[PDB]
């Protein structure tokens, strides 16, 4: 499928950026999680970045670590996450769905099998947090064979050589953490999405003005969740407010 391609084309014809929220699948529970995701979508999310609870997320901060803890507490497993992924796709046919994974979970039962499973449930992209471009060959290849976009992070301390690799290796969108943006477009890199620190409307508009195709809220959404644990209903309400606010800023 070409969900990202279609989304960005649609957003360009409407001169607006994309807003992409991240959440951990199964946090704080399967059911509440499915409700959260549908709320994020109804509030205006352009695409999703979903994380699968991993025992040692050595590439995540405090907020997300707690999300995994909450998810594990509810007994969330990768198999259940994939059951959720399927349910989510069945309800929403065009929204791009990207997964944020850790290498072992992808390699565990065969890298190829993992991407075959992603394609089957309707996943659009996969970003393996602990696989640098130098070690991505097996992953991006498997991803391509199953029509999955291999997403790569373009760090700030990146140099020209890295920009060139990210540009030819990545698909769907470039996960960016002025010059970098222009250079990525120079190398025909996938549309760039500003990440990190994205937690307020003004940050979304700033990203779009800089030339990025959108923004990704790496943990703001997770934060709203942990603060409203005692009230599932108020949680969905605040999530709906924040997301519509963030989305509005991309227009």
């Amino acid at each position: 499928m070409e969900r990202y391609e279609n989304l960005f084309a649609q957003l360009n014809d409407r001169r607006e950026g994309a807003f992409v929220p991240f959440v951990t699948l199964g946090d704080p529970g399967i059911e509440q999680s499915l409700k959260i995701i549908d709320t994020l979508i109804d509030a205006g999310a352009d695409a999703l970045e979903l994380g699968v609870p991993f025992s040692d997320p050595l590439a995540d901060g405090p907020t997300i670590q707690n999300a995994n803890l909450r998810a594990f507490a509810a007994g969330v497993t990768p198999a259940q996450c994939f059951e959720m992924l399927a349910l989510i796709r069945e309800k929403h046919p065009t929204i791009p769905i990207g997964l944020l994974m850790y290498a072992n979970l992808v390699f565990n039962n065969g890298i190829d099998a993992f991407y075959a499973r992603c394609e089957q449930v309707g996943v659009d992209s996969v970003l393996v947090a602990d696989v640098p471009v130098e070690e991505s060959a097996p992953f991006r290849q498997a991803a391509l064979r199953h029509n999955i976009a291999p997403i790569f992070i373009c760090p700030p301390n990146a140099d020209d050589d890295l920009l060139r690799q990210v540009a030819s290796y990545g698909r769907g969108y470039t996960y960016l953490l002025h010059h970098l943006i222009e250079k990525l477009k120079e190398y025909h890199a996938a549309p760039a999405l500003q990440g990190f620190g994205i937690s307020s409307p003004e940050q979304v508009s700033a990203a779009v003005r800089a030339g990025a195709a959108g923004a990704i809220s790496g943990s703001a959404i997770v934060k709203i969740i942990e603060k409203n644990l005692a009230s599932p209903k108020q949680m969905l309400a605040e999530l709906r407010s924040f997301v519509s606010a963030m989305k509005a800023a991309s227009r």
């Binding site: 025992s55 997320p57 050595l58 670590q65 070690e135």
Partner: protein
């Protein structure tokens, strides 16, 4: 690209978030440079000799082998400053950090030994050391915790995850990805992302080089086998390294068998785990059928690394080295035996290696064999542990 091969066969690599690659690359390069720098080698040798107490002795244990055709020697790393082999490599890494112009050190520890070593090295070389340690490990290692603080190191508890060594390892990387400009991550074993497995071996290879010269001097020939315990793989590879090209010399690594392999309560991932990708490397892991990383169990806290060095996995796959396991009880017995017959209190970690040598001897009393056990550390720390058990 890299200067050295990041892989040993299919094992190893550099599986870290993109943001950390520059740190690894810079580190490899400084290492390659330091290894060719005579000045660096002289300074490292000076500290090892005049500060750490190298070379360490090679002790012949006659009482232990009486009545058999086995000759046993123990490489005395238990006599090294700090009481364990870990001191060798932390000294080199600290000089490396200084060579890179870094003034801060970041370290992870479970049993506390590596924390103590990093702290003493930092104190000696004027480095601001901050150490990450799992909350469960803090409670259990009050002594080593006070030692680190006593040496000016900042001890930071890690409550995330299972709050053990693996969880501490993650917090360190997190800190480093954001401060590697001024801080150096002093990993504590021959594992993790390249160039760490390679660097730790080189900074621990004097163990094997000294052992060869010493056995050559006392026996006029190489040993039939060198035996070392394997937690992460640093003392073992340090002993093996210089013998790798000596085909007639058997290399035996010993993983903790815990309560027994069949009980599932052990710490032998190399022979009883499953290959995975964690802590920046492709290596056998202690993990669920699902792919979640599990803890490594053993009566000895120091063999808690839920994985193993890449090179060991490789050396095993080609048949160059053999890996076996020893249970808590076998280690305990070896521990009691050394105290009574040689007057040396071995670390419960090292006791696993000794236990295997004892088995090689006992099972075949009439087999002539020249063995060397790497006594990686002293067991003064295990006195109470062995006490309560024999008491209970």
């Amino acid at each position: 690209t890299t200067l050295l091969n990041p892989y040993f066969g299919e094992f190893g690599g550099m599986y870290v978030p993109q943001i950390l690659m520059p740190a690894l690359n810079q580190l490899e390069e400084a290492f390659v440079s330091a290894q060719k720098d005579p000045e660096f080698q002289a300074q490292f040798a000076d500290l090892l000799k005049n500060y750490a107490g190298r070379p360490t002795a090679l002790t012949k244990c006659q009482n232990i082998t009486a009545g058999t055709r086995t000759t046993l020697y123990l490489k005395r790393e238990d006599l090294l400053h700090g009481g364990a082999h870990k001191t060798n490599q932390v000294l080199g890494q600290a000089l490396l950090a200084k060579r890179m112009g870094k003034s801060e050190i970041i370290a992870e520890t479970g049993a506390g030994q590596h924390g103590v070593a990093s702290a003493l090295a930092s104190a000696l070389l004027g480095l601001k050391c901050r150490i990450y340690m799992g909350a469960k490990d803090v409670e259990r290692q009050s002594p080593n915790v006070f030692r680190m603080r006593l040496m000016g190191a900042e001890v930071i508890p890690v409550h995330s995850g299972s709050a053990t060594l693996k969880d501490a390892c993650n917090e360190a990387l997190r800190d480093w990805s954001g401060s590697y400009e001024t801080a150096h991550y002093m990993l504590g074993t021959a594992a993790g992302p390249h160039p760490y497995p390679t660097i730790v071996r080189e900074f621990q290879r004097m163990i094997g080089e000294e052992t060869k010269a010493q056995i050559l001097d006392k026996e006029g020939r190489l040993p039939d086998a060198v035996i070392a315990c394997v937690g992460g793989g640093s003392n073992a590879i340090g002993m093996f390294a210089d013998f790798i090209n000596d085909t007639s010399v058997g290399l035996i690594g010993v993983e903790p068998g815990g309560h027994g392999i069949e009980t599932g309560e052990h710490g032998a991932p190399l022979k009883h785990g499953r290959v995975g990708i964690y802590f920046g490397m492709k290596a056998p892991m202690m993990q669920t059928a699902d792919g979640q990383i599990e803890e490594s169990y053993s009566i000895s806290a120091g063999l808690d690394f839920p994985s193993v060095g890449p090179q060991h996995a490789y050396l095993n796959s080609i048949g160059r080295a053999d890996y076996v396991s020893i249970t808590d009880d076998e280690a305990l017995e070896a521990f009691k035996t050394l105290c009574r017959h040689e007057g040396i209190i071995p670390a419960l970690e090292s006791s696993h290696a000794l236990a295997h040598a004892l088995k090689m001897m006992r099972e075949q009393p009439e087999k002539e064999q020249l063995l060397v056990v790497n006594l990686s550390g002293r067991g003064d720390k295990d006195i109470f542990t062995v006490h309560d058990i024999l008491k209970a």
